[PDB]
């Protein structure tokens, strides 16, 4: 670990600086360093970790999609042969993306999840596990594709089961988990009806619980509820 010599508090401080500077690769490296100190993460610290890697991998995914589209076009009839370069470069970006996902999943397995006893932390990390298997699934084309998909599904399902037992239907982690699991169903599992059902049920159960909330909690919950509605509008 290149961050092994840096104080945990310094790593967290620098992660926050890197966020302000929009230096998400640095932010992720700082947070990896912080995780590798071996202490549990606070809520704020979990969010730094998630924001960092979300941005890094989000960029990789966007690039991979550009490249995959170019590659697909190259394999249509009437497309003049351009050699191996498009495939090679798509592979390069893919391998880097897979590496980032493996890094994140590694942190979750060693040892964030096993030490996470509170619902809020355990659901947060299992959602992440689902998310990073989902990203691996987006680029999977071979023997292990089904097992990657099932790994995502299993993580999301464990998260759902805990969140339903332990958190109110308006909890932002519970909402965000459902949002993403719904997308998993639509985009990965070829289960659009399950995706729609999930988004709808999640929205309605949240709606019914808004009355219990402060103005600030209301703002947080309704924001994600709008994302559910946005997806529903896209899909129906």
């Amino acid at each position: 670990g290149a961050m092994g010599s840096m104080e945990r508090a310094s790593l967290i401080q620098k992660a926050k600086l890197a966020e302000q500077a929009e230096r998400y690769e640095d932010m992720a490296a700082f947070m990896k360093g912080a995780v590798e100190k071996g202490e549990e993460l606070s809520c704020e610290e979990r969010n730094l970790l998630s924001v960092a890697y979300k941005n890094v991998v989000g960029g990789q995914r966007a690039a991979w999609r550009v490249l995959s589209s170019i590659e697909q076009k190259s394999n249509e009839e009437g497309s003049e042969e351009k050699g191996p370069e498009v495939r090679e470069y798509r592979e390069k970006v893919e391998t880097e993306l897979q590496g980032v996902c493996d890094t994140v999943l590694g942190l979750l397995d060693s040892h964030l999840i096993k030490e996470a006893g509170d619902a809020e932390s355990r659901v947060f990390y299992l959602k992440m596990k689902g998310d990073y298997y989902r990203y691996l699934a987006e680029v999977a084309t071979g023997d292990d594709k089904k097992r990657i998909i099932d790994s995502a599904r299993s993580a999301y399902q464990e998260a759902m089961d805990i969140s339903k037992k332990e958190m109110p239907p308006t909890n932002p982690i519970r909402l965000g988990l459902a949002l993403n699991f719904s997308v998993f169903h639509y985009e990965i599992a070829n289960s659009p009806e399950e995706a729609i059902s999930l988004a709808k049920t999640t929205f309605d159960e949240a709606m019914a619980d808004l009355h219990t909330l402060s103005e600030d909690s209301y703002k947080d919950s309704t924001l994600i509820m709008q994302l559910l509605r946005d997806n529903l509008t896209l899909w129906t």
Binding site: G176, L179, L227, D230
Partner: peptide, 5 residues
């Protein structure tokens, strides 16, 4: 592309 968080 659909919304995720």
């Amino acid at each position: 592309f659909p919304a995720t968080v």
